[PDB]
């Protein structure tokens, strides 16, 4: 239960390239499997991606 709580804290709170739909090879493959800092897909508008 505590591990899944920490998973909720950690994984479920990750931002991304914020592509509305996009193709962008899955947004540069989720920004090279990191989704840390990349949002360049084409022109995607504001989407928090919760």
């Amino acid at each position: 239960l505590m591990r899944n709580i920490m998973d909720n804290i950690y994984r479920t709170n990750q931002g991304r390239s914020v592509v509305l739909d996009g193709q962008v090879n899955l947004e540069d493959l989720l920004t090279n499997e990191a989704a840390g800092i990349v949002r360049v897909k084409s022109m995607n508008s504001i989407t928090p991606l919760e």
Binding site: N8, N13, Q14, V18, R39, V40, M43, N44, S45
Partner: protein, 51 residues
């Protein structure tokens, strides 16, 4: 004569939203809550979703 359809409006809206995506991901750079208050779901948005 030929006309430019709503696609021009579409990618102008997309680019106007994308202006800050390369530096200012923070949506609208400022907050505005006069009708919708802060959400209270799980410890009030822990760690700002890793900021």
């Amino acid at each position: 004569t030929p006309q430019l359809s709503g696609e021009v409006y579409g990618m102008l809206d997309r680019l106007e939203a994308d202006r800050g995506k390369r530096t200012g991901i923070t949506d609208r750079t400022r907050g505005l809550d006069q009708n919708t208050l802060h959400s209270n779901q799980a410890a009030m948005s822990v760690n700002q979703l890793m900021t």
